[PDB]
Design a protein around this ligand. Structure first.
Ligand SMILES: [Zn+2]
Ligand SMILES: [Zn+2]
Ligand SMILES: [Zn+2]
Lengths: 46, 452, 51, 302, 66
């Protein structure tokens, strides 16, 4: 997200979408991994 | 070639003549089969819908790596006038030709065809023993007289004056005989399907008479392409120009008839192989001592060999010959160039020469893989001797014209020389010698320039 | 052909990835390079180049 | 450019076509499909002079060749019936007449044998026969450099569901067609939009899958989407929408399989670990240690 | 995630029999200028989707600086 903001305030909406599209699948993968971690965490606390 | 030649002729045909030509379904079918695969695919994808089709849909149909072939097909169909562009609502919309569409759809689905495929009377003759024998006899007669062997039987005066009015078969009456030309030997070089097509195209060129109707002529030709060997057809479905050209094709050998002025005619194997095609005979062995051993029993191939090979002996399988200087000079004075002589030698080279060339090329690649060499099937010594005999024929080349000199002023000579260079008939110029030369066809322009 | 005394009969946990279609190139998870297509893994949604 | 052999595997099942007629408003859609196929085959023979056509019908009790007819019938015969008009092109007309006479003979034969009802579809066997015919003509090579192409005209009609037993033969047909570089085209004339096995067949053999709902206007579908000669396959894009996922079905539940488990011996697919600690398709006892390694839950601190 | 009877199946079969004997009018395959338009629209939308998918498919070049 910090790299996204850096290219956002460095190059201004023309290519930050391209960088976001480049880094979208691995961001989705790590978000899914953290979501699985949170789900199993809450399932063991409850 | 073949498809290129018939496409060029059909493009040279005017637009309304093409629209009249698209009436018969068999002609439309043959013209469709001439087309490239993308053109054919688009034509069949656009026959069955009566509404409009844009070019953007057809362009989206083609992949990114086939855009050049798509442009080729579009230009071919536009030149053949199978596509009518329309400029409405800002999109260049495409119609199929309506007569072509109706005739092709009728040919596909079956329906009204006004007997464009003929009628069959179910009584037949044998194809291989009679039909093929007659067609082969007429073709062997025409090519034997054409290559110039002594013949007890000569072809008809219609194809005689066709041959003397064609580009090939030069003729003199001071000696009283015919000569094979460069394109005449080229004609023997290509396959007999393209031979028949180029003879038919030159016949189409020379038929300017009112007795011949050109659309009916092409209808008959493409109908014979559509017909089948070995079964009979009626003349009653034909117009009178198609009747007399049925007689002419009987003289050629494209069609067989049992008797003249008969109601029933029989197409031959050349009628079907007019459309498309389908050790060998004539396969020959060349050696470094210029000896030729040609496994040929056919008198046509022996005769064609005799145009540039000094024949020495003949057996049932093979003929003895020797490529000699005077025989090669005979061919070269007949205009048969060394390139096409060597092309004939390559195309009739023996499989044993092929495999020995493959062995030589394999050893060459396993010794020096840095450089690649072409497959020399026949000896380069005899190839270079053929080309050297060509050079010794063509040591000097002559052009006739005028030379203007004895100019006291160099400026006038320079003006005349640059005028000749601008009009493109100059061959040589020099201020040191004060001389510039022009061709005979370019003499008149500079003559009137100097007079005025 | 395996021998009868081998008792290594087990399930192998595997998934069937989905062929992704995209007009924008993305970083692959196996070679870290820009690839247009790829396969999304059913378990972690990481993309692979070949199968 | 180069001639091709178009082999049409047409699935004429009386049950499936009767259900299609009952689902639709019209009746006798077999006639419309058959005549659209006739015009399409005439179009393919019009594309090139030297190209060839084969047709195989997959009826209820097996398969039968429609064009060309059986050589026993060629030797025995010719009662030229007048279904197709004789004034059309003869080179199309013999093909069309042989096709319609074999259609009539097949329908008469299964009218005679109509009483026996079978749950075993013969589409996979017909496609295998078409692939053998493709190999036969390619190996004979009377016309040099002959391409080939399979077109499958099947009907679902919303009555027959997905058939598990067809999975292995269709997969083997995929591999054989990929080896021989012969595309397999599928036209599914029915109500069920998805046919996963034939979709995978088209997408793996570089063919076109087309699902249609009405038998009317089928010749435009055939002449636009299905008229791709293998000469121009790499330069013509395919209209095969709805990309298939290349998944499979579980052996003992039947659902589509996500991340899952296959047997290491007989390669059967299971979405869950089977009861009894034994392989259902394979009858192999599985080790409790490694399947407990499978049954472990992921870890996270409290 | 309608079982047809043998009598009506034979009736449909005999309908196909007589429809094959009496006349097979191949000119009936031609659409009526509206269903052909809808069919061509569906086919060209599928072609547009597939062409946008497979217009473009060593890593490929990027619009980013190095
Ligand atoms: Zn990768
Ligand atoms: Zn994964
Ligand atoms: Zn097992």
């Amino acid at each position: 997200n910090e790299l996204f903001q850096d290219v956002l305030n460095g190059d201004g909406e023309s290519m930050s979408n391209t960088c976001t599209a480049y880094l979208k699948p691995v961001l989705n993968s790590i978000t899914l991994a953290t979501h699985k971690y949170d789900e199993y965490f809450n399932e063991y606390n409850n | 070639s073949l498809k290129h030649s018939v496409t060029q002729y059909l493009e040279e045909i005017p637009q309304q003549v093409q629209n009249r030509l698209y009436t018969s379904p068999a002609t439309c079918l043959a013209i469709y089969r001439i087309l490239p695969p993308l053109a054919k695919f688009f034509i069949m994808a656009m026959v069955f819908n009566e509404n409009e089709v844009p070019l953007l849909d057809l362009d989206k149909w083609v992949n990114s790596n086939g855009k050049l072939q798509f442009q080729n097909a579009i230009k071919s169909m536009k030149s053949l006038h199978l596509l009518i562009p329309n400029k409405s609502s800002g999109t260049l919309m495409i119609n199929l030709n309506p007569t072509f569409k109706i005739s092709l759809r009728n040919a596909l689905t079956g329906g009204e065809v006004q007997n464009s495929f003929g009628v069959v009377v179910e009584e037949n003759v044998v194809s291989l023993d009679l039909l093929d024998e007659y067609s082969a006899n007429k073709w062997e007669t025409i090519l034997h007289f054409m290559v110039g062997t002594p013949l007890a039987k000569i072809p008809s005066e219609k194809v005689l004056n066709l041959l003397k009015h064609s580009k090939l078969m030069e003729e003199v009456n001071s000696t009283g005989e015919f000569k094979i030309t460069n394109e005449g030997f080229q004609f023997l070089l290509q396959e007999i399907n393209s031979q028949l097509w180029t003879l038919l195209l030159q016949y189409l060129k020379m038929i300017e008479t009112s007795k011949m109707d050109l659309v009916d002529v092409l209808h008959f030709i493409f109908m014979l392409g559509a017909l089948e060997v070995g079964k009979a057809y009626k003349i009653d479905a034909l117009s009178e120009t198609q009747r007399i050209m049925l007689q002419d094709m009987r003289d050629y050998g494209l069609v067989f008839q049992k008797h003249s002025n008969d109601s029933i005619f029989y197409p031959t194997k050349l009628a079907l192989m007019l459309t498309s095609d389908t050790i060998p005979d004539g396969s020959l062995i060349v050696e470094t001592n210029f000896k030729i051993y040609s496994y040929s029993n056919s008198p046509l191939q022996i005769a064609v060999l005799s145009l540039f090979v000094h024949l020495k002996a003949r057996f049932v399988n093979m003929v003895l010959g020797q490529i000699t200087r005077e025989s090669i000079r005979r061919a070269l004075t007949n205009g048969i160039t060394a390139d096409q002589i060597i092309a004939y030698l390559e195309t009739h080279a023996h499989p044993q020469m092929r495999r020995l060339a493959e062995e030589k090329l394999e050893k060459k690649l396993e010794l020096d893989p840095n450089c690649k060499e072409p497959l020399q099937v026949l000896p380069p010594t005899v190839v270079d001797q053929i080309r050297l005999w060509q050079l010794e024929l063509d040591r000097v080349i002559t052009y006739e014209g005028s030379l203007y000199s004895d100019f006291e002023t160099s400026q006038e000579y320079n003006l005349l020389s640059k005028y000749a260079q601008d009009i493109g008939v100059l061959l040589w110029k020099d201020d040191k010698k004060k001389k510039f030369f022009i061709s005979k066809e370019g003499n008149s322009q500079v003559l009137d320039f100097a007079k005025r | 052909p395996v021998n009868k005394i081998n008792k290594g009969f087990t399930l192998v946990k595997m998934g069937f990835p989905t062929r992704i279609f995209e007009d924008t190139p993305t970083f692959c998870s196996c070679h870290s390079k820009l690839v247009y297509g790829g396969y999304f893994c059913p378990n972690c949604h990481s993309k692979v180049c070949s199968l | 450019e180069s001639p091709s052999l178009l082999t049409v595997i047409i699935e004429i099942a009386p049950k499936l076509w009767t259900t299609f007629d009952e689902e639709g408003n019209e009746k006798g859609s077999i006639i419309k499909v058959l005549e659209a196929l006739i015009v399409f085959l005439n179009a393919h023979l019009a594309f090139n002079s030297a190209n060839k056509v084969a047709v195989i019908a997959a009826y209820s009790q097996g398969i039968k060749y429609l064009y060309p007819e059986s050589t026993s019938a060629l030797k025995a015969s010719r009662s030229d019936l007048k279904i197709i008009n004789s004034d059309m092109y003869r080179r199309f007309r013999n093909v069309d007449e042989t096709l319609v006479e074999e259609i009539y003979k097949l329908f008469e034969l299964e009218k005679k044998q109509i009483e026996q009802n079978s749950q075993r579809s013969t589409l996979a066997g017909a496609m295998s026969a078409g692939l053998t015919y493709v190999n036969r003509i390619s190996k004979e090579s009377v016309t040099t450099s002959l391409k080939s192409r399979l077109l499958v005209l099947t009907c679902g009609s919303g009555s027959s569901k997905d058939e598990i037993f067809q999975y292995i033969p269709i997969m083997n047909c995929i591999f054989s067609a990929t080896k021989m570089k012969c595309p397999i085209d599928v036209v599914k004339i029915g109500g069920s939009k998805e046919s996963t096995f034939l979709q995978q067949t088209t997408d793996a053999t570089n063919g076109v899958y087309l699902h249609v709902e009405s038998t009317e206007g089928l010749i435009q579908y055939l002449a636009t989407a299905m008229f791709i000669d293998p000469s121009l396959r790499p330069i013509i894009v395919k209209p095969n929408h709805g990309s298939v996922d290349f998944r499979t079905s579980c052996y003992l539940t039947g659902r589509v399989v996500a991340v899952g488990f296959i047997c290491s011996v007989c390669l059967c697919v299971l979405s869950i670990i089977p009861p009894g600690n034994k392989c259902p398709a394979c009858d192999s006892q599985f080790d409790e240690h490694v399947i407990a390694k499978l049954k472990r839950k992921p870890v996270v601190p409290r | 995630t309608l079982k047809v009877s043998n009598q009506q199946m034979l009736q449909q079969l005999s309908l196909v029999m007589d429809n094959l004997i009496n006349k097979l009018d191949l000119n009936q395959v031609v659409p009526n200028n509206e269903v052909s338009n809808k069919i061509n629209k569906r086919v060209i939308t599928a072609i547009k989707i597939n062409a946008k998918q497979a217009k473009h498919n060593l890593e490929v070049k990027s619009t980013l600086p190095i």
